[PDB]
Amino acid sequence: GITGTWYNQLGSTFIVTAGADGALTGTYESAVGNAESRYVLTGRYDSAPATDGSGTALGWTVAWKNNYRNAHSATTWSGQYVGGAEARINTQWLLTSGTTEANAWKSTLVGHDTFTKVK
Amino acid sequence: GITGTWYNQLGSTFIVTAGADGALTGTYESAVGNAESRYVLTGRYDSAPATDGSGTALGWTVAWKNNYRNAHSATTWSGQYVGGAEARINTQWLLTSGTTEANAWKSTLVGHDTFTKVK
Amino acid sequence: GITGTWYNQLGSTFIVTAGADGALTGTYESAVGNAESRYVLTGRYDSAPATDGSGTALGWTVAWKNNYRNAHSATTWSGQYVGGAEARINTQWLLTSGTTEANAWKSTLVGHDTFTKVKP
Amino acid sequence: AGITGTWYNQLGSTFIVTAGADGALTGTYESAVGNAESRYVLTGRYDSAPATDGSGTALGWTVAWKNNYRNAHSATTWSGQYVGGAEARINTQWLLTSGTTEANAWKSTLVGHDTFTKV
Ligand SMILES: O=C(O)CCCC[C@@H]1SC[C@@H]2NC(=O)N[C@@H]21
Ligand SMILES: O=C(O)CCCC[C@@H]1SC[C@@H]2NC(=O)N[C@@H]21
Ligand SMILES: O=C(O)CCCC[C@@H]1SC[C@@H]2NC(=O)N[C@@H]21
Ligand SMILES: O=C(O)CCCC[C@@H]1SC[C@@H]2NC(=O)N[C@@H]21
């Protein structure tokens, strides 16, 4: 259910393949921030989720360097996939920028992204 | 400097290889929680960091399923590598469990782990 | 604007008064968790926000002890009030439970609540 | 009662607090970093009947970063627990939200962790 194209509330595009082995691989294109075009992502998901009606835990990382620019930053998304008619991936994320030690207190943004199969 | 065996303040063991393509690959073994033995990890890091004294941004994911146990959960660590005489990786993390829709409000733990190469 | 009765996406009820010099005071009633009835809250907000369309920063705390039970925990909400035709308070929160040192790694839940004045 | 007094975190900030019998926290905060000058009002709450099994005492407080000297249009909340004894600490995680346009709301919130000691 996870493999495919997903869109969050910002209009970013998350292209992912879920491997039989628990791997997530794909590309991420952000609608905002110091980013242009596609970035590599890799992550992991629970390939044998609970028998009951529970979400499928997952996470992935983008480092914001590609052939066009380098923001010296990385975002990790941690969340769960929920299938069905209005399938969603509900996430919280941490975006860490490379900082000097003096500025490390302000290195990390936190937020939440909800991904759907429709824009 | 990222490639190696790292330990956090809980005693967990993070074995990682940093590839020239920006990939992080390896295994994680937690000293705590619903976990036993090693788990696959994958992540990304900035392969061309700033040269101005800033750390190197990175992130990785563990889904807590292996051949022995499945916690139906995933952790993402977002942080930066700080080089020096005593290299360190400073992270914040998000641990999401698969939940029902009604219990989604309590799906995600947050914390912070600091890693060094001192066993 | 901020003063009023607010409800989040869980159906929890946030009754707050914004004071002239930056105080937030009121009661919180959670629809979920180890909680029943109302709890005291206190917080702070920016009483002189920007006038450029930016939201109004604010935050508050609940310790989850009242006359009926005590969860040995506290939540803080950090967020901003967004004025307009549909007033909204958008927050992220941290819920810390009192733990032993050995369990401190799992002391804190994180989430996000959005509040409106629409009664469920 | 162990909460009442002057605390310092790892940044050099000073946290001056009084714990009321009813569960109130009141005092002042002076940050060593950020868009901040002199003391700011804080208010918060703590568990005034904590467990007696060696667990910490849950607490939180808020600073809005306006005082008579300046206004950063931001607020921080600290959520954590007090741990007593010879090496007393208040261990926290925090969320700092800046007032933003809706277009920039995705980057409104910084997250971190502060450890307060009596020294
Ligand atoms: O500005 C940067 O340093 C890189 C781009 C950051 C984009 C963030 S990642 C979290 C949030 N979700 C998105 O789809 N975009 C932003
Ligand atoms: O309990 C689970 O659901 C799986 C084990 C989680 C262990 C967490 S991940 C964050 C923290 N850092 C560690 O080294 N262990 C814990
Ligand atoms: O279970 C507890 O320890 C006390 C109740 C916590 C309820 C939380 S606070 C964050 C979220 N928002 C709500 O309205 N309820 C939950
Ligand atoms: O820059 C601002 O908007 C106001 C100052 C923020 C200071 C933060 S609060 C979290 C962290 N802990 C501190 O003691 N200072 C910083």
Reduce the secondary structure of D12-67 to three states and give it as a string: CCEEEEEECCCCEEEEEEECCCCCCCCCEEEEEEECCCCCCCCCCEEEEEEEEEEC
Name the structure determination technique. Answer: X-ray
Q: Which of A30, A77, A105 to mutate to test the interface with D (most CBs of D within 10 A)?
A: A105
Name which of D19, D26, D21 is nearest D2 in CA terms: D19
Instruction: Indicate the number of domains in chain B.
Output: 1
Q: Could you tell me how many CB contacts below 8 A there are between chain B and chain C?
A: 31
**C67 close to D (CB below 8 A):** no
- Touching D: A residues 3-22, CB under 8 Å: 10
Burial of C47 (0-12, 13-18, 19+ CB in 10 A): middle
Name which of B32, B92, B27 is nearest A22 in CA terms: B27
Nearest CA in chain A to B97: A57
Q: For residue B46, what are the contacts with CB-CB under 8 A and spacing of at least 6?
A: A63, A64, A65, A70, A72, A73, A74, A98, B22, B56, B57, B58
**E-only strand ranges, B1-119:** 4-8, 13-18, 23-29, 39-45, 56-65, 70-82, 88-97, 108-116
CATH number where C12 lies: 2.40.128.30
The tokens describing C83, both together, are 């004025």
**C112 close to A (CB below 8 A):** yes
**B106 close to C (CB below 8 A):** yes
Cα of D34 vs centre of ligand 4, distance in Å, is 5
- β-pairing, C39-45 with C56-65? antiparallel
The tokens describing B108, both together, are 């995600």
Name which of A62, A56, A58 is nearest A95 in CA terms: A62
CA D13 to chain CA mean position, Å: 10
The conformation of residue B117, written as its DSSP 8-state character, comes to S
A98-to-B43, C112, D70 alpha-carbon distances in Å: 16, 26, 29
Q: Determine if ligand 4 sits within 6 Å of the CB of residue A100.
A: no
Q: Which domain holds residue D75?
A: 1-119
Distance CA A14, CA A75 (A): 13
Q: Closest approach of chain B CAs to the CA of A11, in angstroms?
A: 23
**B109 close to C (CB below 8 A):** yes
Q: Which amino acid is at A82?
A: V
Distance CA A82, CA A79 (A): 10
